[PDB]
Design a protein around this ligand. Structure first.
Ligand SMILES: *Cc1c(COP(=O)(O)O)cnc(C)c1O
Ligand SMILES: *Cc1c(COP(=O)(O)O)cnc(C)c1O
Lengths: 284, 283
């Protein structure tokens, strides 16, 4: 089971319920969150994630998060996990609008074991299918009210999209816009390799900006790799030398099969795993 | 505010109920329904329990045990009716449960009807059209998007309303990418034209409104033609009346659309009466 740490720094008893029945995180999915990886005694890219928490909170008209109190709760939760186990941990920051009719927002951090599915996805890779998201490429900017760039607690469709792919024998999904441009995964950001330069869809599309992807581009640029944001199509995916689904939890999952077509492997696949490994510890 | 779990416990409202890893708060993974408590009973209970079943099927949630839900609704209702003669906002919460645990989370909750609802029934709302971002063939050609389910993931619905609130608008009418009228973030859109009532078809990426369906049933019985049609923004303005229909805000007439003040029509008073009779057709 998991560990809970409120921003007061108090660690919760394992069995005690925390949230009220009228908390807007549960009644309306009204809140924002972030996911952190605990590896080798510390959480990875803490500050980069707290900046996205601020950007998500700003988009959601939530009180601006108090970073000194969040940092302390992360440090306390981290020290409890690494004390209990040497395994990697899944750290989550939950930031809700609070109870209904009550102004105090709900905030706590939570660490849980890393699911075994990610260890296989890192190890073996994934098979993915392309799905039409339904949004055009101008969705994130021309329609700001749709808050597509925010990591909200309203993940029902993302989970349903994965359930749909599971029934099709696929391990993940790549969303594509109505006009045919690659968007993102339901829980990951798409990164491409070509000829050496690494490409990902631009962030002004109706997609999130990935903390892992940004840290990946920064180290890759420092090591001599040209990185750039371009509009990608499904054909560009198949003509590539590699496809990855990058995320804070699943560091780098290579897409070995896309829509039933097996994609060939490239020597670049082993170095890519090193880059994300080096990326998530760039803050250290 | 009263909470009644399906386990049969009538709980204190301020006592915490949910765990920190409950998927309703961690991922919004669940379904819900909202019912109005009026004159000693909840309105259109069976129609609401049927959509709860339909929402759970789209969400791969366990098939709801309706006898247990009926008891939780009847118990929660009668405790409200005992405390007050006021109308109540009763909602049923049905989540996938905790992480790594197979038991789904289920409970009923009653709260007072907000004052916003009392004004909207009396005076109506001003609404703006907004691009939903989905095309009109979105609900069918993209079944994975579960657009037809009343899910706990309303972050966009609430964010869309805050956006309209900052512009001085009281509600929103979603419009598809190709320009078809969809629904409201919390309501079903109904139009009047010449004595004819129209609503968007349910195969669009929209919910099926329990109130609108009951409205069509009563309206047809009293001689009014009702039908499902594809509407465009022009159809709204050439209409004789626009309403946002929902279980709590029974019928909110749109008095201002995209800044254009819309005049009142004799059908407007009849429209309010029909919805009143519809929500008690099961009685
Ligand atoms: C969390 C998430 C990502 C990846 O974000 P990271 O900061 O890199 O972990 C990508 N897409 C979606 C939809 C997400 O929710
Ligand atoms: C709840 C809801 C409605 C109306 O549903 P009723 O069963 O009539 O109350 C309409 N549109 C949306 C988006 C809703 O969530």
């Amino acid at each position: 089971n998991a560990m809970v740490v409120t921003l007061d720094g108090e660690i919760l008893q394992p069995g005690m319920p925390l949230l009220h029945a009228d908390d807007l995180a549960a009644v309306r999915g009204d809140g924002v969150f972030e996911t952190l990886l605990v590896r080798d005694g510390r959480a990875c890219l803490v500050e980069a994630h707290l900046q996205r928490l601020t950007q998500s909170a700003r988009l959601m008209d939530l009180p601006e998060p108090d970073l000194p109190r969040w940092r302390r709760a992360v440090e306390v939760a981290t020290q409890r996990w690494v004390a209990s186990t040497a395994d990697e941990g899944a750290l989550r920051l939950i930031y809700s609008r609070g109870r209904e009719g009550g102004s105090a927002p709900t905030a706590y951090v939570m660490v849980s074991p890393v699911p075994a599915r990610v260890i296989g996805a890192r190890r073996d890779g994934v098979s993915a299918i392309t799905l039409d998201r339904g949004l055009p490429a101008d969705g994130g900017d021309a329609m700001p009210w749709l808050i597509a760039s925010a990591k909200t607690l309203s993940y029902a469709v993302n989970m349903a999209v994965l359930r749909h792919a599971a029934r099709q024998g696929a391990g993940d999904v790549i969303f594509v816009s109505t006009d045919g441009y690659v968007l993102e995964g339901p829980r990951s950001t798409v990164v491409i390799a070509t000829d050496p330069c690494l490409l990902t869809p631009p962030p002004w599309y109706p997609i999130l900006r990935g903390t892992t992807q940004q840290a990946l581009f920064e180290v890759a640029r420092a090591k001599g790799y040209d990185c750039d944001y371009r509009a990608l199509r499904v054909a560009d995916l198949f003509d590539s030398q590699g496809i990855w689904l990058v995320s804070s939890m699943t560091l780098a999952a290579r897409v070995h099969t896309l829509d039933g077509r097996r994609l060939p492997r490239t020597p670049i696949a082993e170095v890519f795993a090193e880059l994300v490994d080096a990326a998530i510890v760039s803050d250290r």
